[PDB]
């Protein structure tokens, strides 16, 4: 849910800052979605996790 299986993009870590400027640890998780990718155009799918960046760049083929 936070690691892409293609580029390895993982969650960043930073601080959520409140109005009182309290800084609390939080994560910027990648937008990885469960994609039934088709590696070869043969047809058989495989459920992997790919970031929407990879889905957009075309590193997932839903053939």
């Amino acid at each position: 849910a936070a690691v892409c299986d293609i580029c390895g993009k993982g969650p960043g870590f930073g601080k959520s800052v409140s109005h009182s400027h309290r800084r609390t640890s939080r994560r910027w998780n990648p937008n990885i979605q469960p994609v039934r990718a088709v590696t070869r155009p043969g047809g058989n799918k495989q459920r992997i996790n790919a970031c929407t960046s990879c889905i957009k760049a075309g590193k997932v083929s839903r053939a």
């Binding site: 088709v38 889905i55 957009k56 075309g58 083929s61 839903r62 053939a63």
Partner: protein, 151 residues
């Protein structure tokens, strides 16, 4: 997504038309179902789209055409050239489904899609005659007799 229609799509355009579609529309419908190819390097894509359309129109096997090609399977031996050694027949360039379709359509005129060829089951890996199954429907499995000739 800029893509070239390989076939007809209602309310989208004619086969061979360049269209801008939503990435999801081009990635979940057009590209997967083969109704288009991405508008990649134009020099190649321009011919690729029309070639795909022609291959789809010529290689299509209808229900009746399945039995028609089964009956046509009475063709004799089909020769296939391959770069292999003259001692054992080991194939430097392994046979391919496209190669089998090419040999078949060169010797005779049963146009067919490469995917209907049971090449791995044939497992030629040698020189000589090697029967190959061509599955044209769920119940028709023609058997071609492919001879292998070295280069």
């Amino acid at each position: 997504m800029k893509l070239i229609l390989t076939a007809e799509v209602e309310h989208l355009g004619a086969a061979g038309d360049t269209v801008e579609v939503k990435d999801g529309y081009g990635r979940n419908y057009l590209l997967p179902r083969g109704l288009a190819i991405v508008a990649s390097r134009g020099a190649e894509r321009q011919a690729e789209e029309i070639r795909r359309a022609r291959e789809s129109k010529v290689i299509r096997d209808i229900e009746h055409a399945n039995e028609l090609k089964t009956a046509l399977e009475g063709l004799g031996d089909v020769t296939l050239s391959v770069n292999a050694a003259g001692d054992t027949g080991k194939l430097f360039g392994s046979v391919t489904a496209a190669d089998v379709v090419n040999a078949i359509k060169k010797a005779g005129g049963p146009n067919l899609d490469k995917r209907t060829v049971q090449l791995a089951k044939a497992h030629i890996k040698s020189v000589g005659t090697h029967p190959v199954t061509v599955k044209l429907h769920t119940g028709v499995e023609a058997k071609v007799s492919l001879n292998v000739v070295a280069q």
